[PDB]
Structures are given as structure tokens and as C-alpha cells.
Amino acid sequence: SRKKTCPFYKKIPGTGFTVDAFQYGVVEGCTAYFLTHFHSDHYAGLSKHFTFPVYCSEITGNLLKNKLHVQEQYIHPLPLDTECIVNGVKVVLLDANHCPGAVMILFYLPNGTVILHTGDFRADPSMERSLLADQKVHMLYLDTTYCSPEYTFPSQQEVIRFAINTAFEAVTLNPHALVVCGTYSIGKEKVFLAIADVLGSKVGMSQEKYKTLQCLNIPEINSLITTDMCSSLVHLLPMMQINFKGLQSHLKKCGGKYNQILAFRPTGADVIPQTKGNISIYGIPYSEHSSYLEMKRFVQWLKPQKIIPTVNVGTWKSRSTMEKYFREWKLEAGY
């Protein structure tokens, strides 16, 4: 398999900087590799053999060190909201409101171009009150995961309220019911923690997952999570188990102590579960990405001059369609 070459949307023009570009070997000219967050599509390629500078948040740096064994000497964690000079360039990391340690990166280029790379983010009104507020941003590298008008979904808070009210009612109807959530990466902690909290329980999980959550600076985490599954009413399983076979199979462990499973999994408030026997799976629209409305609001507020989409950029047609939305957002706001 021939190593691929770093595409342009991961390069910061005229700098020696790349963002989330670890799977291409030595990128020619790259002197500093930024990692926006610890999701595998973004970190793919990093390992103990990576020997160029990696800039990232402190949570991401802990994860690089402890899970991927990146050598400490190449990990450069930067605090949020604070100007840092990197190979002569002024950079600022901001909270992306995505998963723990996820950042957006503000680059002040020598030539006066100001660039915002959102990494993955879920656009919030609070970003309109950050450092972004101060100077003009010319070029925006935008997380366009849900850059389509049909992508609507409630706030995280509405989804979590649905989830805790559902779980509560479920265990009131059956004290021997088990609540399950799936995971395959960091993020979405707020969902299983709010469930566990409403059930007065800790979240039961594997040794591996318990260690990962230690890297995340979640206040009093050890009081909320546990590896003793049999003591907990909320279990966290691999996403691949969240299906009737995996769940029927989990119900046979802990010695048949539980006789029903209620499971939550993200889609693909006001939802129909799939039910087979004593297993129910609710697909809930919990998202760590901007909805189409959230994205449009943020961009109309930021008023950038050029937008480089970084998701769903696999076809010309898709790239053009996004550009067309962006041009419509300009026409409508005026900028």
C-alpha cells in the first residue's frame, strides 16, 4: 500500500504547519504538526516513532503520551486562550465544544492573513464572546460534518434530559433493568454520566476505558466510574456491541442479575426505540458537531473571506455544494 500524500486542506498556506496530518509519513516542509483532538481519523499515524513536534491541548497530550506512547519530548501542550509562538508564528488554541481536549486553532500569519481552523467543533453562542470577537478572520477551515439544511437536531441538554427521563422511568417500571451506552472514542461522557447520576450509580466499564477517562480532567471522575460492573446500573460497552445479539449476550453475563436492557446509541427528544424481547435500543440525536443552523450562525457572525471545508470533501460535487451554501450565507448577511 503506497503511503498517501498530505492533501492541501490539511496545510496552513505559506507556513510549515499541518493540522491532523499524521498518516502521510514525513510531510515535506512540515515543521510542526497540530492535532485538534484525540479522534482516530485525526490522530491516525501517530505512535512512538513519530519524531516531529506535535502541538495540541493538554488533554490531547496526555492521551498521546499514555495511549499512543508518543515520546514526551515531541508533545507540546498549549494552554487555551493564550498567545504562543510556534516557529515564529503566533497561535491561539480555543475550546471547540466537541470532545474533551478538542481545540480550534487561531493562526496569525506573518503576511497578516488570520486563519481559524475549527478542527471538529459544535458551534456555540459563547464562541461569539471569545477572542474571535476581536480581529477579522480571513480564512476559515470549517468542520462541515453536517453542512446540509436537513441536519437538524436538539441541543445536547435536550437530548440528555430525554435520556435521563427515559432511563429513570425504565428502572422505576423494572428495578432489574440495565442501562447500557456504547462508546468507541472519547466524547459523549456527559450522556452516560448524567444517566448514572440520575440512577444514583457509577458507570461500569472495562479497565481500558476507565484508564482512558483518567486522562480527561473530569472533576471527581473516580467517584462516577468503576470497573466493577456488577455493582453498577449503567454499563458502557464497545459501540459494536450495541445491537440485539451483543446485548442479548451481555444480558447473560453478571449471572443473569439483570433481566432487561435499555440501550442508548447516537442516531445512525421525541424518539421510537427498536425493541426485541427484553432489549430496547434508543437512537438519540446527541451530536458533538454543529447542526446546519449552528454552523450558519457561527459563519454569518464570523464573516470570513474564504472557507475551506474539511469534512465530506471527497467529491468535487460535494465541495461545490458547500461553497454554494457559503455564498448564499454571504448574500443574505452581506460581507
- Between 156 and 201, whose beta carbon lies closer to Zn ion? 156
Identify the residue whose cell numbers are 504538526. 33
- Between 120 and 246, whose beta carbon lies closer to Zn ion? 120
- Between 109 and 218, whose beta carbon lies closer to Zn ion? 218
- List the one residue from 20, 120, 143, 189 that touches Zn ion (CB under 5 A): 120
Residue 250 touches Zn ion, criterion: CB under 5 A: no
Residue 39 touches Zn ion, criterion: CB under 5 A: yes
- Between 39 and 250, whose beta carbon lies closer to Zn ion? 39
Instruction: Check if the beta carbon of residue 154 is closer than 8 Å to that of residue 285.
Output: yes
CB of 312 to Zn ion, least distance (A): 14
DSSP string, 28-74: TT--EEE-----HHHHTT-STT--S-EEE-HHHHHHHHHHS---GGG
Instruction: Check if the beta carbon of residue 234 is closer than 8 Å to that of residue 204.
Output: yes
Residue range at the interface with Zn ion (CB under 5 A); choices 22-30, 49-57, 115-123, 203-211: 115-123
CB of 190 to Zn ion, least distance (A): 15
* Residues preceding chain discontinuities in the chain with C to N over 2.5 Å: 268
- Between 97 and 166, whose beta carbon lies closer to Zn ion? 97
Instruction: Check if the beta carbon of residue 182 is closer than 8 Å to that of residue 263.
Output: yes
Residue 189 touches Zn ion, criterion: CB under 5 A: no
CB of 204 to Zn ion, least distance (A): 25
Binding mask 65-104 for Zn ion (x = CB under 5 A): ----------------------------------------
- The grid coordinates of residue 277 equal 424481547
DSSP string, 133-198: GTS---EEEE--TT-STT-----HHHHHHHHHHHHHHHHHH-TTEEEEEEESSS--HHHHHHHHHH
| Binding residues vs Zn ion (CB under 5 A) | 39, 120
